[PDB]
Amino acid sequence: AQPRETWGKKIDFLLSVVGFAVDLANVWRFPYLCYKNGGGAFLIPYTLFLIIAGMPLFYMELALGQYNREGAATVWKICPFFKGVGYAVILIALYVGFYYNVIIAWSLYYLFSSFTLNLPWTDCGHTWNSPNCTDPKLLNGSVLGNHTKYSKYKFTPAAEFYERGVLHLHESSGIHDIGLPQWQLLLCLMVVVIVLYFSLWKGVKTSGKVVWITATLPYFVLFVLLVHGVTLPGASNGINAYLHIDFYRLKEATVWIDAATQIFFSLGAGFGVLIAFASYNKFDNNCYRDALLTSSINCITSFVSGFAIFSILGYMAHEHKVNIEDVATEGAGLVFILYPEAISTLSGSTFWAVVFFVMLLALGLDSSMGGMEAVITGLADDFQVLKRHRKLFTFGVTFSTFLLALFCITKGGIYVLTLLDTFAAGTSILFAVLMEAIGVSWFYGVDRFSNDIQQMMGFRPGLYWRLCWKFVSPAFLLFVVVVSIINFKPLTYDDYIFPPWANWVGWGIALSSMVLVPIYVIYKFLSTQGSLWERLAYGITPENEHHLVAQRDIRQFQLQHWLAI
Amino acid sequence: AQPRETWGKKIDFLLSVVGFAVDLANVWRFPYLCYKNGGGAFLIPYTLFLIIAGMPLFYMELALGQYNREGAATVWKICPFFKGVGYAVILIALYVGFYYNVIIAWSLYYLFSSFTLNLPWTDCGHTWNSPNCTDPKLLNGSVLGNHTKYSKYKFTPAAEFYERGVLHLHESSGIHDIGLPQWQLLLCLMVVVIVLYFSLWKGVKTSGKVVWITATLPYFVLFVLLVHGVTLPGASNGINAYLHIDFYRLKEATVWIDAATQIFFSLGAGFGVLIAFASYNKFDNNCYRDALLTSSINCITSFVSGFAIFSILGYMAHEHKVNIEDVATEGAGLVFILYPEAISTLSGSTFWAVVFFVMLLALGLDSSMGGMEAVITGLADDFQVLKRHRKLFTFGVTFSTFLLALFCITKGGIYVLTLLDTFAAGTSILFAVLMEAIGVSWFYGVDRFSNDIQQMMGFRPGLYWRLCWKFVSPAFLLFVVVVSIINFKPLTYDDYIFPPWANWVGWGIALSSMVLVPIYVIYKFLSTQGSLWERLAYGITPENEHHLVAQRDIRQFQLQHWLAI
């Protein structure tokens, strides 16, 4: 009936892929996965996984979404057996938006609080804060003794505003007693979901105007802080902390689950967002240059964000009594605790704080928009009734996301906000790309994909990209899955330790998305009315080429198809 | 269009309406209300309300369901402006089944506990019941301290097994910290919802026979219990205190309101279950005699169960050397605490306890099945897509009920259960039956309803039923609503006062239903196109005759429509 929707501008696609790719401020936590005796801890595995796995999978997903012209779930019409990975990545993006909306609400609350002339991170006299009065210690405010306690800095006005003034984490004991949703956080989440609904109800063409500003703002906001990165007196050592060059000295380099999860979250592989954006893209486009530019921009953004966060850490280290590694505050609020501290000391703190919070809100809204749009497009392509009802389905998705986010915006919401997400996310995305690592490669065929790319544009992927799609990336993803399943440590917060049942709940939530692939395989095997050979043929052959099943001509049965690269 | 699957025999329907009528409420509440409100003078308001507003409601439910063989929601096609009441009753039935399956799981766990030879509630000492660590006294064997009210005492092994050993209420303090669902209660609830799905997966073609067993299950039990009722030493005092004629209590206003509420809650009129059950029946079934027989069976069953209840109470009082008013209590607490203890005191505790818990399961499962069949018939007849694939829709409904019942089976689920029950049931079902009576009697017309009954059974109802539908029943329902709104007391537990926000959540659910009804009203008003008179006509005129709007033959805009008796 209605033709396939397309972008209004080609530059809009390159802006939207970046506006979804900018998650390298809150999710880029180097002190979390930091080194102990290795030196290069996250940079080396980040670069390795971006080179060997990031660009190949990005290019593959882009070309697949552009050629098949379908959603994440409806692309596997090329191979109906591995169609459960579509629902898997849909659930991935849904669980991601669940906790991302809470980050957007936190950013909105901080932006609303920063409007005052006296910032809440400048004093401890209940200046829009909730201190327990047991440790209101302020270093620059009140000169005191060097009672560092390996630099316990959850008592600073910024950290107290974060975990007590915003989150109210003191009232909740942990996951066992989350409490009740906070009213101000509830209003922030309502505003966030209302903005997302008013952005996504009309379609992608409307969001094409919002992605422009939400992507152009961070480029302006980052430079004003980078120019003041090491201009501060003690912040220089921060840069000296980052350029730690170790040639042959490493402990955990080249192998890290968190690095793979971070690169897949930054690029978007394993979520359906790339496939959804490629679905609206025109048939004739250069996925190669787009993927290369996206990877380069993400790498440069990671580099500059690490430089900035380390400069802020060094400044906080020089201004206050310091333990080198623990001077900052861990968790999912790294920026919300590090940047306001340095901004308050900087002259004209109101303007810098407002601009930084506007940037953090704009990146978060765009990321959550890209995450939810993948689910919307996939479920709409799967069920044409949902295509006929765009506004109602968008409202339903946003309302479900708002209702299921109440457990993450409560008093002990953050205890869930990472843990659940983390578990699912990691396993989920791995499994997702893992299945995809087989999907286009073995069952569909690297040769057929290369031929489709050659038919799409003149240039054909060389030996490097094909060997990465067929051998390098599947083996890498299998190794990461194995090291994640075997080398699994119980999830814990800065001080709280989750009970054994929380780990089981997280693993069950991850398995809910994981088992979506074998369940659909069994469904396809049972639904087809035929012999075992006919069932296997209908499973591993495209829908358009099902007639060849009757003619007894299947390429996957012969070994020449598998051996071909 | 496949015809509606009628009942195999009329006995199935006649036994299903009885199984829906009688439940645990006719056992634990009716005798206590008889004792408190006048003793032997409680049937003067009871039978009067039954004959003037209780039987007239059952009649106007069965006839409306038989003439219009549709669901609870879809039956409002003679007046589209009241079709939102058909969703209100479905939501009410769902909210009540949310906590009724919890009492069913309680009865199932009690049966599983009584399966053993040595019952848990017999003696203390961590005999499968969590001890309060405050020297749990023997009921009266060891400690002769009974100066205080025995029912209020929670140190007996039965009460300890009820609240600590089944509810696990010691780990919770209220609705702010509920806890986690109890694993054994979760398994019991899962078995309950599984057997309910197995009974309702094919509808009345396989469910009625099931209730057949229930049709004989409690009564026979009560029968043999009544036998023990005449043999227990001390039951004479309980029998004399159950029918002690006190004609001076009929003057206080706390006797008539309680009797009216008891009648209305025990008959189950206006819950959609009656309309659903009377929909599969043929067009010639005599709903008048059926309603009269059902009401008479319900009232006689309540009366004869009060005899066994008071016989057990008198036996317990004689063994405890206390008065009848001390052991006099009501509710699930009352039964689960006192009846198992009396059975333990009775010879052959295993058989009597098993038979009592089987009677309880037969009273619970039939009521929950009737409540779920109403929602099924209401949603399946409104959305024709749900007409087919009943095995999936029933599974979805049962799974949603199981998931939304985890807040009632947890360590502090009794508070949520009481909140939902009281607020939702009372307020929402009162508003719903009031709107139903107003729409059937005033907006549709009692003369048309009498003509429909005449076409159904050959005889038109007389002036008594035509007066107890338009004047007696609406005024009665409005008076009960006014009493429930003005005499509303803050929610409270045995010792725990509910915080203000719990009452606000309960009133929020009630107001959600009571605006969802006018939400559908204004939806039908705005969705129709035309002038104001045309909108009102499309809202009030039956969908069967809509050409009268163009012909300007709307009878509802005439004085004779409202002046017809």
Ligand SMILES: CN1CCO[C@@H](c2ccccc2)c2ccccc2C1
């Ligand atoms: C007549 N009936 C008696 C038994 O049925 C119960 C029920 C259960 C599930 C769905 C709807 C009603 C019930 C519960 C509370 C209040 C009144 C009633 C009404």
Ligand SMILES: [Cl-]
């Ligand atoms: Cl009753």
Ligand code: NA
């Ligand atoms: Na029953």
